[PDB]
Design an enzyme around this catalytic site. Structure first.
Site, mmCIF file in Angstrom:
data_model
loop_
_atom_site.group_PDB
_atom_site.id
_atom_site.type_symbol
_atom_site.label_atom_id
_atom_site.label_comp_id
_atom_site.label_asym_id
_atom_site.label_seq_id
_atom_site.Cartn_x
_atom_site.Cartn_y
_atom_site.Cartn_z
ATOM 1 N N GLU A 339 0.854 -1.200 0.000
ATOM 2 C CA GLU A 339 0.000 0.000 0.000
ATOM 3 C C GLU A 339 0.893 1.255 0.000
ATOM 4 O OE1 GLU A 339 -2.460 0.410 3.454
ATOM 5 O OE2 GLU A 339 -3.672 1.997 2.570
ATOM 6 N N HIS A 364 -4.652 -4.468 -0.811
ATOM 7 C CA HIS A 364 -4.214 -3.313 -1.609
ATOM 8 C C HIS A 364 -3.303 -3.712 -2.755
ATOM 9 C CE1 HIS A 364 -6.057 -0.642 1.268
ATOM 10 N NE2 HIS A 364 -5.278 -1.104 2.239
HETATM 11 O O1 LIG Z 1 -7.186 -1.258 16.127
HETATM 12 P P1 LIG Z 1 -8.558 -0.997 15.561
HETATM 13 O O2 LIG Z 1 -9.161 -2.216 14.904
HETATM 14 O O3 LIG Z 1 -9.475 -0.391 16.604
HETATM 15 O O4 LIG Z 1 -8.378 0.146 14.421
HETATM 16 C C1 LIG Z 1 -8.230 -0.228 13.032
HETATM 17 C C2 LIG Z 1 -6.769 -0.468 12.728
HETATM 18 O O5 LIG Z 1 -6.715 -0.865 11.336
HETATM 19 C C3 LIG Z 1 -5.918 0.040 10.593
HETATM 20 N N1 LIG Z 1 -6.508 0.174 9.252
HETATM 21 C C4 LIG Z 1 -7.820 0.472 8.955
HETATM 22 N N2 LIG Z 1 -8.020 0.702 7.671
HETATM 23 C C5 LIG Z 1 -6.775 0.546 7.083
HETATM 24 C C6 LIG Z 1 -5.819 0.215 8.053
HETATM 25 N N3 LIG Z 1 -4.460 -0.034 8.010
HETATM 26 C C7 LIG Z 1 -3.767 0.143 6.936
HETATM 27 N N4 LIG Z 1 -4.123 0.472 5.680
HETATM 28 C C8 LIG Z 1 -5.205 1.408 5.373
HETATM 29 C C9 LIG Z 1 -6.573 0.783 5.611
HETATM 30 O O6 LIG Z 1 -6.677 -0.437 4.783
HETATM 31 C C10 LIG Z 1 -5.911 1.319 11.407
HETATM 32 C C11 LIG Z 1 -5.862 0.756 12.834
HETATM 33 O O7 LIG Z 1 -4.521 0.355 13.157
HETATM 34 ZN ZN LIG Z 2 -7.541 -2.179 5.195
#
Ligand SMILES: O=P(O)(O)OC[C@H]1O[C@@H](n2cnc3c2N=CNC[C@H]3O)C[C@@H]1O
Ligand SMILES: [Zn+2]
Ligand SMILES: *[C@@H]1O[C@H](CO)[C@@H](O[C@@H]2O[C@H](CO)[C@@H](O)[C@H](O)[C@H]2NC(C)=O)[C@H](O)[C@H]1NC(C)=O
Ligand SMILES: *[C@@H]1O[C@H](CO)[C@@H](O[C@@H]2O[C@H](CO)[C@@H](O)[C@H](O)[C@H]2NC(C)=O)[C@H](O)[C@H]1NC(C)=O
Ligand SMILES: O=P(O)(O)OC[C@H]1O[C@@H](n2cnc3c2N=CNC[C@H]3O)C[C@@H]1O
Ligand SMILES: *[C@@H]1O[C@H](CO)[C@@H](O)[C@H](O)[C@H]1NC(C)=O
Ligand SMILES: *[C@@H]1O[C@H](CO)[C@@H](O)[C@H](O)[C@H]1NC(C)=O
Ligand SMILES: *[C@@H]1O[C@H](CO)[C@@H](O)[C@H](O)[C@H]1NC(C)=O
Ligand SMILES: *[C@@H]1O[C@H](CO)[C@@H](O)[C@H](O)[C@H]1NC(C)=O
Ligand SMILES: *[C@@H]1O[C@H](CO)[C@@H](O)[C@H](O)[C@H]1NC(C)=O
Ligand SMILES: *[C@@H]1O[C@H](CO)[C@@H](O)[C@H](O)[C@H]1NC(C)=O
Ligand SMILES: [Zn+2]
Lengths: 497, 497
Positions: A339, A364
């Site tokens: 990504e 991605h």
């Molecule tokens: O810890 P949580 O579950 O409460 O928060 C969600 C977690 O996922 C991550 N995330 C959510 N959308 C993406 C994530 N990472 C990388 N690429 C972009 C996208 O694809 C952000 C956080 O670290």
């Molecule tokens: Zn994601």
């Protein structure tokens, strides 16, 4: 070679036909009703493209989602895709996949919800059943009191939504770089973390994911979840197996209620900011849940911003641990990988490690088109690439979506599934917005219903359902698809052509 | 167990990554020990800038708008090395856009009978008129000599002329924020200079300046698109295209006889694709005749001007097939601009199909090529070099972050590529160094070093249209330049030992 125009036309059409046959969906044979719908879709697609090209104005399907959302929703191609059964959404995060409006209108109307303004001037939300929270960096106030004293409850609720959504302004303008918009994205999660980890809110939010996805004609979801830390009003903090069981019970009740829905499965996610020592424990946890919840717990993924954080190679002994056991354990992986706009770096080389580790799907894979040998391995093994177009635009990998790096993947028939990633964060639908932009931007003017149909079938065929579940789901999908075709012919007044 | 140890894992990983390194442009080059010293320094610098952007979370300046990156790159060692480096050839250039606007101002507008006016869009225009002021049709012409003398500030006056003509006075990505806005500005630039730059002695001298400037940037050979037509004398006499070609032939001969360290130049006739097919037919017949009677200086034919809204190759196909249909056949070489577009599956990007069916010797831009796998095959099989013009493609609206440039996946597959600058005079670029810098920093990876540079340089002579004798001599000359550059570079950067 071309004494007349017929010979030239034949050679031209052979080359172009070869590419149309090669790309995603090129071997599909549409039936006569599907062809009528296809002809209309292709007429519509040509008219919007030719207007942009010949009247010299921007192509709205490819501009910022902030600008295009309200424009695309009134068009026939969008309305057709909205009605279309999507199959499955295979790349979703469980705290980002239901509407912020529900957080506001439902979660923030519950007892014991507090709010504060943080030092960056964003609202945070949390729950505390044991007094107000300590004033650590912000001053917590009971939402019920603030709302009742606002003098305009509609404006107060709209302000909450506006302060939380990434589509309140155009992120490409307001947060005009990768690391600025990731700052805003990370902040969004911080704003909601307290409230969305309160157990009954978390349960009901997950049920809302299923309701909204079914409502967008999606019949199946695979969702990344951290699983752990859900907390009760009395302060009880639950473990990851409880979080998994909570989701299992909600899914079973949902499928009982809606037999037209195939259901859900879960991937454990952990953020790639933690020490390798901790990732090791999350791998062990995932091995245990995979053994004891077969067919509901799928495997493991590493999430959070890819460029500045830890690579897969930085966790390689943890990720190899299952395969090294005696007897070996095959823990499935769903790595977010590549990504990035970088090339020849530790970040896009995550794609190499993802393949060496036998990833079931790749999240991605934006950098994949820069890696010809990784592409060939992806094709020969059938590792589907989960393509999240609105996410990749708003989170800073590309501006004009016709430059999305999955377009050349689809042109070579790399296996691809479309998904929405974090639709609740920026006010997208479960699938229809991302499917629209994939269809209008990542394939050509002469690509029609056959591409849509293949991408929909791909989302079941490259899901992690077992073979029996896949056959059942495809029978249900075929019935939905047939109904969608007949309805569309009636709706767009196509039946007599 | 496939990877029981770290050594087994890294062996597999390194073989896979290395296999892709061998496949990309330059991947089969073996650098000698002096080259390796320079390469090690280049790679340390490249990693330093990329790691800073990635880990300190700030934008990668080599990939941002040239308006912003130009002054930043010019103070860096990698830029200074590329500046000193012999470039070989610039194969994609337009003859009214390849010398400095500063020379138009300081030299051409200091000549007798030069007039200026502000047009209805508030842009200055320049022309020559030997009889009196030109008819005041849509602007009021004034003698530049009088306006300069009365400006009250001559240096500010000349600076304003330059500022009013250059596309780099402001950032075009901000000031003209769409494909059709910036093409409006680009078209305007040519309209501003057209009168003055078609006056015969100025045109002769401007072509000589192209040669001097390119030689000064360590470029030894150019192939130049030119209309050849409409060069006019002070008394109103308008010359035919053959005269324009003979004029350039004499300038070129004098230049190569003055500078044995310069290989020379050859010319491609260009015509704007806004004209009726009857005009293109006449220019195709002209090109046949000049190809026959000026072999080895006249190369062939190209269609130029904005590709998306104007006529496709297929729109001219009867004219373009006419030489091959003569008895006996006549093989008019073609250098088509093709696929300079973000469109897919349309009449524009399918120009790539026609360009290959018409046996193009090189393709200009080929931005859409990565979306066309069957065309890629033919390009590789036939050795049809793609002329990649990275600054042009960014500023003229095909891409924002140059790491998204569609030629990076071409280079990773070793599609034959030459780097060129297109219209460097229009936006204040150097003949080759700026484009070579952005190609090296944005279109290949962090671990791609001097071997990529060397291969792109050699490609520009190998895929020139020199005959066998010329090419052998030019490559010996390039080798000598290269050796001097390596030795000088080791001294300059204190790399000896
Ligand atoms: O810890 P949580 O579950 O409460 O928060 C969600 C977690 O996922 C991550 N995330 C959510 N959308 C993406 C994530 N990472 C990388 N690429 C972009 C996208 O694809 C952000 C956080 O670290
Ligand atoms: Zn994601
Ligand atoms: C979130 O809400 C806060 C509080 O209303 C917003 O703060 C306002 O910001 C604008 C522009 O920065 C100012 O004109 C107001 O004076 C601010 N109010 C306060 C109390 O500081 C903030 O802009 C919102 N953030 C987002 C991203 O919507
Ligand atoms: C070309 O020059 C004209 C004339 O000087 C510029 O027009 C001026 O634009 C400025 C903006 O800085 C205004 O404040 C002035 O009022 C304008 N002057 C006149 C006489 O209209 C024009 O902007 C320049 N164009 C470019 C692209 O540089
Ligand atoms: O008429 P002139 O020769 O004095 O002007 C030059 C002619 O070339 C055209 N051109 C110049 N740079 C390019 C052109 N076209 C297409 N793509 C972008 C770029 O590659 C503009 C004009 O028609
Ligand atoms: C361009 O716009 C005009 C007026 O809005 C419209 O009539 C015409 O059909 C458009 N051209 C195309 C190709 O859509
Ligand atoms: C919130 O959702 C719950 C559970 O789905 C429901 O009981 C409750 O009525 C909702 N609250 C509001 C304000 O709609
Ligand atoms: C990957 O899968 C293959 C084929 O099933 C197997 O032989 C190999 O051991 C696996 N590798 C890893 C690293 O788990
Ligand atoms: C980040 O920036 C700091 C401050 O300039 C510098 O010390 C450090 O070396 C940088 N890190 C990288 C990887 O460039
Ligand atoms: C312009 O160039 C010509 C041709 O090289 C030269 O003779 C002349 O002196 C130059 N004009 C100025 C002002 O230097
Ligand atoms: C293209 O070149 C081929 C192979 O050299 C030749 O046989 C054919 O006649 C050419 N076609 C045209 C249209 O020039
Ligand atoms: Zn050009």
């Amino acid at each position: 070679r071309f004494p007349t125009m017929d010979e030239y036309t034949n050679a031209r059409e052979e080359l172009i036909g070869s590419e149309q046959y090669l790309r995603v969906g090129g071997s599909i044979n549409l039936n006569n009703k599907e062809k009528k719908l296809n002809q209309f879709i292709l007429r519509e697609k040509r008219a919007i493209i030719e207007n942009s090209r010949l009247n010299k104005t921007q192509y709205i399907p490819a501009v910022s989602f902030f600008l295009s959302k309200s424009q695309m929703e009134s068009t026939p191609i969008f309305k057709i895709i909205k009605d279309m059964p999507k199959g499955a959404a295979l790349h979703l995060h469980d705290t980002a996949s239901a509407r912020i409006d529900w957080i506001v209108s439902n979660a923030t109307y519950r007892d014991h919800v507090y709010m504060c303004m943080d030092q960056d001037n964003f609202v945070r939300l949390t729950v505390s059943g044991t007094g107000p929270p300590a004033n650590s960096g912000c001053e917590w106030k009971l939402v019920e009191t603030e709302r009742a004293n606002s003098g305009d409850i509609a404006a107060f609720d709209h302000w909450l939504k506006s302060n939380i959504s990434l589509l309140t302004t155009d992120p490409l303008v307001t947060y005009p770089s990768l690391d600025k918009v990731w700052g805003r994205f990370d902040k969004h999660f911080s704003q909601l973390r307290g409230i969305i980890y309160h157990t009954p809110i978390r349960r009901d939010y997950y049920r809302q994911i299923l309701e909204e996805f079914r409502s967008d004609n999606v019949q199946y979801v695979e969702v990344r979840s951290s699983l752990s830390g859900y907390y009760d009003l009395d302060g009880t903090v639950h473990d990851p197996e409880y979080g998994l069981q909570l989701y299992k019970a909600v899914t079973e009740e949902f499928v009982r209620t809606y037999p037209d829905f195939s259901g859900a499965k879960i991937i454990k996610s952990t953020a790639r900011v933690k020490p390798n020592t901790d990732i090791f424990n999350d791998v062990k946890l995932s091995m245990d849940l995979y053994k004891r919840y077969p067919g509901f717990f799928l495997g493991f993924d590493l999430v959070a911003q890819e460029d500045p954080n830890t690579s897969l190679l930085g966790y390689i002994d943890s990720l190899l641990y299952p395969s090294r056991q005696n007897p070996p354990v095959s823990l499935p992986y769903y790595f977010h990988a590549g990504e990035t706009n970088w090339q020849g770096t530790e970040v896009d080389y995550n794609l190499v490690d993802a393949l060496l580790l036998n990833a079931t799907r790749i999240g991605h894979g934006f950098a994949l088109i820069k890696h010809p040998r990784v592409i060939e391995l992806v094709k020969s093994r059938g590792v589907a690439v989960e393509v999240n177009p609105v996410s990749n635009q708003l989170l800073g990998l590309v501006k004009d979506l016709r430059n999305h790096a999955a377009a050349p993947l689809l042109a070579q028939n790399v296996p691809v599934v479309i998904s929405s990633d974090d639709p609740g964060v920026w006010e997208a639908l479960p699938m229809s917005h991302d499917m629209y932009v994939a269809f209008m931007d990542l394939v050509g003017e002469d690509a029609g219903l056959d591409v849509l149909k293949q991408l929909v079938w791909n989302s079941i065929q490259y899901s992690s359902m077992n073979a029996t579940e896949k056959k059942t789901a495809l029978k249900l999908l075929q019935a939905k698809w047939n109904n969608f075709i007949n309805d569309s012919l009636i709706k767009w007044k196509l039946t007599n052509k």
